[PDB]
Amino acid sequence: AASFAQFSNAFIDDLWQLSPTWALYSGKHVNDGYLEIPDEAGRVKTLAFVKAQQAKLKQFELKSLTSNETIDYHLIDNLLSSMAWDITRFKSWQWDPSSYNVAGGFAQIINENFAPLDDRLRSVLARMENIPAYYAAARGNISQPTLEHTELAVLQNQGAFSVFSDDLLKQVADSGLSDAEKALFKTRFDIASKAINEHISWLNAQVSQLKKEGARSFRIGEELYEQKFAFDIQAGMTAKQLYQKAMVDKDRVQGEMAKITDKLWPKYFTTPKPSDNKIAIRQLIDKLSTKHVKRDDFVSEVRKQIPELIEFVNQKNIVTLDPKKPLVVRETPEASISAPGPYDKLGNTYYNVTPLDGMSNESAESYLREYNHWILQILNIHEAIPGHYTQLVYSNESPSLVKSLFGNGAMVEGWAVYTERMMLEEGYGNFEPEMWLMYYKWNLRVICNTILDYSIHVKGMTEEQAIALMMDEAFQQRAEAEGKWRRATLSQVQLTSYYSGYREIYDFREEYKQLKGKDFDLKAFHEKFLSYGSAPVKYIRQLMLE
Ligand SMILES: [Ca+2]
Ligand SMILES: [Ca+2]
Ligand SMILES: [Ca+2]
Ligand SMILES: [Zn+2]
Ligand SMILES: [Zn+2]
Ligand SMILES: [Zn+2]
Ligand SMILES: [Zn+2]
Ligand SMILES: [Zn+2]
Ligand SMILES: [Zn+2]
Ligand SMILES: [Zn+2]
Ligand SMILES: [Zn+2]
Ligand SMILES: [Zn+2]
Ligand SMILES: [Zn+2]
Ligand SMILES: [Zn+2]
């Protein structure tokens, strides 16, 4: 009889046999030469896999599992339910033509310049076989598409030619493949190129028809939104509940900002203070944003700050940090943490911080105003200490393949957002009003991301309303607002992840303070919270309370 550990490993093996492209994206090259044709037999086969793996899952008593195993159990169960639901209910395979594009799988094979070239090219040689079939399947599946995803499909499939390029042909011509393999490659490449171009023509004809005749709305509606929110975020509340909390937080945050602005106004202006609080807040913020690190010192300011945050976390006993896992700041190759995937045992972990070269003087200045004297410190909390990097180190204490592959984005992001608030509450920057004001504008991004995503998909918010939210309520620039609208038209639920995890973590903390009273230790709370890795916050709560 298989143990749960044996089952977990067999499950991943079976998942990769069903979808070797998913394996490829996860960093395991089980069959790079096999292009899955996304037709009805594909869906039937996915649903037969869901059914068989679910029945294997149900053989394990939940009382028979350790804490890590129970996390894996739930992550697997939820992944399975959401696969089935994607096929039978959400049906993005019908209305999102952008989900049909071969370029991605090919780029992952080709762009590993360390992997043997002849092996890569032979994988590509085989993977090209079924490109015509792949796009024939696409056209037979697509039905009542949205205008927006069809437009995205055109643009992304046009990008396929930066992979299916003259440069790929040259690599093939000068490789160690046999002359017969080279000629086959050319034959298949011409057939592939023709098929991609004919599909793009078809997509163009569709966009044109959708513009004339009307198209399915991009707004997924309440029923689908709640189901997607449950599968993706795995919050301990509904989306409607989170939205209602986001509306209240927006008001609380703006009220605090108005108070700070009243106190700081005479310190920075001699002109009168506008009676509309929101114009006043916007003007004070624009003025404070001119204090920023000099452009050429951006990367150095970051290196200087990280040890300052380390010192502060140690001094205040916020969480144990290990001095011999020193974080290496590096100037980004072609600000975020990059870390090896579960199948990459070699790779190192860095803090990628992009120097401001390439950009115009004017873009650089706009960037430095966004990442100003205060916001740069908050960014380094979020990204490095005690945010993402710290949480990643803690998750390396008790890892599992399942958590590494299918872990919860809401928890990972929610933690990083939580740390910003917790650090300031614990005295970071010594309760400086400027710092709090800037933090609050930053917090509004996260709150308003939730309002926006929900209101668009559930409440029919218009483009003009979405732009006025982001600019007038969250004090963002035009370009940022427009980018956010576009992202919300093309994706659903992901935008709520930041606030959802933050709210659950902070509320769980306050609940735990209540339960332990005088015996509440902040540091012990943090370390125990981080010990489960990237599990959904509600499961961490349940394990910590049980
Ligand atoms: Ca077939
Ligand atoms: Ca528009
Ligand atoms: Ca406005
Ligand atoms: Zn098997
Ligand atoms: Zn690889
Ligand atoms: Zn049929
Ligand atoms: Zn359960
Ligand atoms: Zn309100
Ligand atoms: Zn400046
Ligand atoms: Zn400094
Ligand atoms: Zn500074
Ligand atoms: Zn300062
Ligand atoms: Zn983050
Ligand atoms: Zn339990």
Residue 358 falls in which region: left (phi positive, over 0), alpha (psi -120 to 50) or beta: left
CB 473 within 8 A of CB 444: yes
Is 463 annotated to bind a ligand? Reply is: yes
Q: Which ligand is nearest to the CA of 489?
A: 2
Q: Which ligand is nearest to the CA of 2?
A: 4
Distance CA 151, CA 154 (A): 5
112 Cβ neighbours under 8 A, 6+ residues apart = 120
Is 457 annotated to bind a ligand? Reply is: no
- Helix ranges (DSSP H) in 19-165: 20-26, 40-57, 67-85, 92-95, 103-110, 117-127, 131-141, 147-158
462 Cβ neighbours under 8 A, 6+ residues apart = none
| Environment class of 180 (CB within 10 Å of its CB; exposed 0-12, middle 13-18, buried 19+) | exposed
CA 13 to chain centroid, in Å, comes to 25
CB neighbours (10 Å) of residue 531?
A: 16
Is 301 annotated to bind a ligand? Reply is: yes
Q: Which ligand is nearest to the CA of 254?
A: 8
Is 362 annotated to bind a ligand? Reply is: no
CB 407 within 8 A of CB 535: yes
Farthest CA pair distance, the chain: 80
Closest by alpha carbon to 386, among 319, 303, 304, 300?
319
CB 522 within 8 A of CB 383: no
Q: Which helix (H) or strand (E) holds 331?
A: strand 328-331
Residue 329: strand pairing partners: 351
Is 112 annotated to bind a ligand? Reply is: yes
Q: Which ligand is nearest to the CA of 541?
A: 14
Instruction: Report the separation in Å between the CA atom of 40 and the middle of ligand 6, taken as the mean of its atom positions.
Output: 7
Q: Which ligand is nearest to the CA of 6?
A: 4
406 Cβ neighbours under 8 A, 6+ residues apart = 75, 76, 79
Instruction: Report the separation in Å between the CA atom of 462 and the middle of ligand 2, taken as the mean of its atom positions.
Output: 10
Is 151 annotated to bind a ligand? Reply is: no
Read off the amino acid at residue 63. Answer: K
Enumerate helices (H) and strands (E) in the chain, giving the number of each: 26, 3
Distance CA 41, CA 278 (A): 56
Q: How many Cα atoms sit within 13 Å of 294 on the Cβ side?
A: 3
Instruction: Report the separation in Å between the CA atom of 217 and the middle of ligand 12, taken as the mean of its atom positions.
Output: 47
Instruction: Report the separation in Å between the CA atom of 76 and the middle of ligand 1, taken as the mean of its atom positions.
Output: 27
Is 14 annotated to bind a ligand? Reply is: yes
Distance CA 315, CA 157 (A): 53
Distance CA 278, CA 411 (A): 32
C-alpha to C-alpha distances, 296 to 246, 334, 357, 366, 368, nearest whole angstrom: 38, 19, 9, 14, 11
Q: What is the DSSP string of 430-489?
A: TT-HHHHHHHHHHHHHHHHHHHHHHHHHHS---HHHHHHIIIIIS---HHHHHHHHHHHH
CB 309 within 8 A of CB 502: no
Instruction: Report the separation in Å between the CA atom of 186 and the middle of ligand 1, taken as the mean of its atom positions.
Output: 24
Which resolution, in Å, applies to this structure? 2.2
Distance CA 316, CA 307 (A): 14
Q: Which helix (H) or strand (E) holds 524?
A: helix 522-529
Is 29 annotated to bind a ligand? Reply is: yes
Q: What is the 8-class DSSP label of residue 142?
A: -
Instruction: Report the separation in Å between the CA atom of 50 and the middle of ligand 4, taken as the mean of its atom positions.
Output: 13
Q: Which ligand is nearest to the CA of 474?
A: 3
Is 226 annotated to bind a ligand? Reply is: no
Instruction: Report the separation in Å between the CA atom of 41 and the middle of ligand 1, taken as the mean of its atom positions.
Output: 6
Distance CA 540, CA 418 (A): 15
Distance CA 228, CA 225 (A): 5
Q: Is the peptide bond before 132 cis (omega within 30 degrees of 0)?
A: no
Distance CA 318, CA 325 (A): 17
Pairing mode, strands 328-331 and 336-338: unpaired
Please, which experimental method was used? X-ray
CB 455 within 8 A of CB 486: no
C-alpha to C-alpha distances, 457 to 278, 285, 293, nearest whole angstrom: 27, 31, 39
Is 222 annotated to bind a ligand? Reply is: no
Distance CA 348, CA 537 (A): 27
Instruction: Report the separation in Å between the CA atom of 42 and the middle of ligand 12, taken as the mean of its atom positions.
Output: 57
Closest by alpha carbon to 161, among 120, 139, 124, 189?
189
Instruction: Report the separation in Å between the CA atom of 17 and the middle of ligand 4, taken as the mean of its atom positions.
Output: 8
Closest by alpha carbon to 86, among 492, 411, 488?
492
Distance CA 287, CA 272 (A): 15
Closest by alpha carbon to 448, among 498, 383, 518?
498
Q: Which ligand is nearest to the CA of 249?
A: 8
